Structures are given as C-alpha cells and as structure tokens.
C-alpha cells in the first residue's frame, strides 16, 4: 500500500503515485512484477531494485502525441 | 597506378583503415567514422602498403 508506507517520505510518495499511477491498483497498493529469471531469488532482487530505483528517482511516439495534441489545440482554439 | 594507403585517426585512438587513391594525388585527409569515440573524425594518411 503506497499511501500507508511510512518508510517512504511524503513528497516522494506523492511523486511515486503521480508517476506510476499505471501500476497502482484500485485498492491503493503498488504492484511490481519480475519474470526475468527462473530463480525467485533473482526475481525478488529485481523487484527490490525496482523499488529502490523508484524511491531514488522520486528523491531526484512522443512526437506523434505532441503533434496530434498541437492539432487538438488548433481545433480547441474556438472561444465563445 | 593506384595505391592502397593506411589512414590513422587524428583522435589518438589508434583506429585505422585502408583506402585506395591515385598515386599522383597528394596526401589524403578524410572524415571517417571512428568507432572508439563514436564520432566522425579526421583521418590523415600514415602509410602506403601496396601498389594498385
């Protein structure tokens, strides 16, 4: 549960929520999966390294979407 | 009439490549891609190997 994770600071917790809301379930918990090895030891180590990377970054196609959003603005331009 | 020449990079990486040039032409200097520095850098000639 990301919100009730007292070992994570408040602003980095909010940054994690707004950055990885696509991995937050409806019950408000973060989900992380690893399937990169046939050892659960290495899979769990990968998952923990993902958590550590998320915490440290919170502490610290795109062209197509940009151009279509610009065209949506150019259609959006009409006021009352 | 032509010659094979070895051109060494000016980046100091020791990278080098062989090209052909006419014998009557002057000493060659080109812009060739150096894979050590990942950048297109100057290569000057440094040796002549064999006659073509």
């Amino acid at each position: 549960h990301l919100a009730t994770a007292e070992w994570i600071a408040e602003p980095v917790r909010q940054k994690i929520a707004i950055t990885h809301k696509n991995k937050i379930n409806r019950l408000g918990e973060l989900i992380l999966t690893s399937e990169s090895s046939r050892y659960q030891f290495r899979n769990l180590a990968d998952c923990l390294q993902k958590i550590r990377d998320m915490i440290t970054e919170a502490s610290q196609k795109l062209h197509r979407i940009r151009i279509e959003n610009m065209n949506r603005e150019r259609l959006r331009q009409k006021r009352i | 009439k032509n010659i094979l020449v070895r051109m060494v990079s000016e980046a100091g990486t020791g990278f080098c490549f062989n090209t052909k040039r006419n014998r009557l032409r002057e000493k060659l200097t080109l812009l060739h891609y150096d894979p050590v520095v990942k950048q297109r850098v100057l290569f000057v000639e440094k040796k002549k190997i064999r006659s073509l």
């Binding site: - | 000016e10 980046a11 100091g12 990486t13 200097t29 812009l31 050590v36 520095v37 950048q39 850098v41 100057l42």
Partner: protein, 41 residues
C-alpha cells in the same frame, strides 16, 4: 596509469578536434574553388 594516459590523450585530441573539423572543411571548399577556377580556365 596506461588507461588514464590513453584516455587523457583521446580527450586532448577530441578537445582540439572541432577546429580541425572546420579548417579542413574550409580547405576542402577552397579545393573546390581552385577546381572550378581551373575548369573555368
């Protein structure tokens, strides 16, 4: 020491590099100018 010396030499050459880029390029376009003068002759 050997690795640091090689990296320092490479860094020095790459630091000096863009000026040789631009003056070799102006030399090449001067070769073009001499060639077009000679074929104008």
């Amino acid at each position: 020491q050997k690795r640091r010396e090689r990296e320092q030499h490479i860094a020095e050459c790459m630091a000096k590099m863009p000026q040789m880029i631009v003056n070799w390029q102006q030399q090449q376009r001067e070769n073009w100018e001499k060639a077009q003068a000679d074929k104008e002759r």
